[PDB]
Amino acid sequence: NAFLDDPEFADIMLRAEQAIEVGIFPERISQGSSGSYFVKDPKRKIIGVFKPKWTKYNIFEMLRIDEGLRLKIYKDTEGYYTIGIGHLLTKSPSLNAAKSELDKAIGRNTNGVITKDEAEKLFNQDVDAAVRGILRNAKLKPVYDSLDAVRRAALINMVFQMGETGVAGFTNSLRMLQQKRWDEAAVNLAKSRWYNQTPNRAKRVITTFRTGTWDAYKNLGRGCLIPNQGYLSEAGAYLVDNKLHLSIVPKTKVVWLVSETFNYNPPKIGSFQLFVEGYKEAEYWLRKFEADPLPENIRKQFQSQFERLVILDYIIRNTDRGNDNWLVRYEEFLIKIAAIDNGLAFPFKHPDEWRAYPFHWAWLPQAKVPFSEEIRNLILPYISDMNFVQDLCEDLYELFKTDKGFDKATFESQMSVMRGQILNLTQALRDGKSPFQLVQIPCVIVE
Numbered sequence: 001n002a003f004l005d006d007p008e009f010a011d012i013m014l015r016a017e018q019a020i021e022v023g024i025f026p027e028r029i030s031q032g033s034s035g036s037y038f039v040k041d042p043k044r045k046i047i048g049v050f051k052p053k054w055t056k057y058n059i060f061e062m063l064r065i066d067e068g069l070r071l072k073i074y075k076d077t078e079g080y081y082t083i084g085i086g087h088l089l090t091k092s093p094s095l096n097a098a099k100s101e102l103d104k105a106i107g108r109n110t111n112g113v114i115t116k117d118e119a120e121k122l123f124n125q126d127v128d129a130a131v132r133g134i135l136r137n138a139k140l141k142p143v144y145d146s147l148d149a150v151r152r153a154a155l156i157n158m159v160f161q162m163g164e165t166g167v168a169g170f171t172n173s174l175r176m177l178q179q180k181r182w183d184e185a186a187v188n189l190a191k192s193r194w195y196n197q198t199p200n201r202a203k204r205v206i207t208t209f210r211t212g213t214w215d216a217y218k219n220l221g222r223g224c225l226i227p228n229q230g231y232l233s234e235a236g237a238y239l240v241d242n243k244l245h246l247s248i249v250p251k252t253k254v255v256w257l258v259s260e261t262f263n264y265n266p267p268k269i270g271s272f273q274l275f276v277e278g279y280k281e282a283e284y285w286l287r288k289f290e291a292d293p294l295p296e297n298i299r300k301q302f303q304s305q306f307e308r309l310v311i312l313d314y315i316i317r318n319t320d321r322g323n324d325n326w327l328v329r330y331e332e333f334l335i336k337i338a339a340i341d342n343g344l345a346f347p348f349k350h351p352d353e354w355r356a357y358p359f360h361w362a363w364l365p366q367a368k369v370p371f372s373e374e375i376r377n378l379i380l381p382y383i384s385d386m387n388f389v390q391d392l393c394e395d396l397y398e399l400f401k402t403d404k405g406f407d408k409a410t411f412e413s414q415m416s417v418m419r420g421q422i423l424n425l426t427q428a429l430r431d432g433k434s435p436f437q438l439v440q441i442p443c444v445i446v447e
């Protein structure tokens with residue numbers, strides 16, 4: 001914990017260690033999923049928040065992903081009774097009717113509950129039924145026969161979902177596939193009730209028809225954040241704040257601490273953010289201002305604090321900003337924002353928009369106010385300076401490369417996302433837009 005360049009922070013870390021030496025330990029903030037601690041000094045005063053640091057693809061795996069696995073009867077998209085891996089039991093609203101159909105299919109009295117092996121057995125039968133539907137059908141067989149194996153799986157998938165008659169209705173789409181007009185078929189297929197009803201699944205299936213690859217199935221749920229590097233995201237947010245002089249992130253650094261109160265299986269690395277006093281959740285003050293609106297001078301100061309927050313979150317592409325984890329202090333500044341809890345930023349890619357990770361401040365009426373001339377003149381000279389942006393990237397490299405799991409390609413991905421954010425923010429500030437308009441702009445990267 002040498003902080004040669006920041007003696008003020010060093011002395012805070014020294015008070016922390018001295019309190020631990022005399023038994024005063026960090027306490028979990030919330031007793032349950034404790035990964036956060038209030039660190040105290042010798043006088044038992046809170047001074048900081050410490051946060052310690054072969055798949056086989058085929059029609060079976062494809063449909064497992066699209067249909068999931070339930071062991072008890074549930075309702076589906078439409079609402080019909082279903083179990084296992086997308087096995088439709090009956091159209092009837094009668095739950096007893098469903099349990100009856102189930103008991104026939106399984107060969108015992110299930111009462112609407114089966115095992116994994118029974119689920120998998122029904123699954124196999126259903127895939128076989130689908131292939132039978134295909135081969136017995138005059139419009140489908142010729143198409144099926146003409147396709148490679150991966151595209152054949154896409155077609156089985158559709159038949160499994162919609163039934164043989166349903167898929168046979170895609171007369172022109174089917175002919176297009178058979179002529180190997182992949183792009184045209186893909187376009188035509190998206191213009192369907194099928195797609196509109198289940199657009200995420202349809203999109204995966206159509207991508208498979210279009211490419212003859214498993215690419216729409218390969219990376220699901222990988223997310224957009226590098227794993228187990230929240231402590232560096234916390235430190236990185238403060239680094240960005242400081243370089244732009246935003247002054248809304250409390251000082252946050254990577255430190256080592258040892259404490260009995262930590263969860264061990266020996267110093268632990270993690271982020272240490274200075275504790276700020278007298279703040280409430282933004283949502284609390286937003287509620288209070290409905291009855292007691294801010295006088296113009298303070299409304300103006302608040303909106304310039306807000307603009308700083310927006311600039312921070314946009315540049316680091318925060319994926320986790322709610323209106324509970326930016327804080328506001330209100331009784332030099334008359335009103336002040338603290339941007340805390342910055343552990344889920346610097347993604348290595350823009351989100352896929354199946355999960356949008358929106359900024360919750362974007363829902364606020366305030367977000368539709370254009371950026372002030374004040375903020376524009378302060379920030380534009382930095383972010384439009386390519387030298388400044390390079391130096392920022394170099395600063396973040398020096399911080400991020402310290403982690404055992406660091407990977408150069410992934411970091412350069414993080415930076416191409418960040419540089420993209422900065423480019424869009426530059427244009428938005430030049431265009432005199434609002435935070436709300438800013439978040440509309442399609443995402444770009446700088447390669």
Ligand SMILES: Nc1ncnc2c1ncn2[C@@H]1O[C@H](COP(=O)(O)OP(=O)(O)OP(=O)(O)O)[C@@H](O)[C@H]1O
Nearest residue numbers: 029035036049250273274275276277325327340341
């Ligand atoms: N720097 C700070 N100063 C004052 N209070 C803080 C600070 N950082 C966090 N807190 C408070 O501590 C509580 C939890 O903080 P934080 O969210 O950062 O930890 P967490 O365990 O990740 O929780 P979450 O899961 O809520 O993100 C919140 O009430 C927050 O307001």
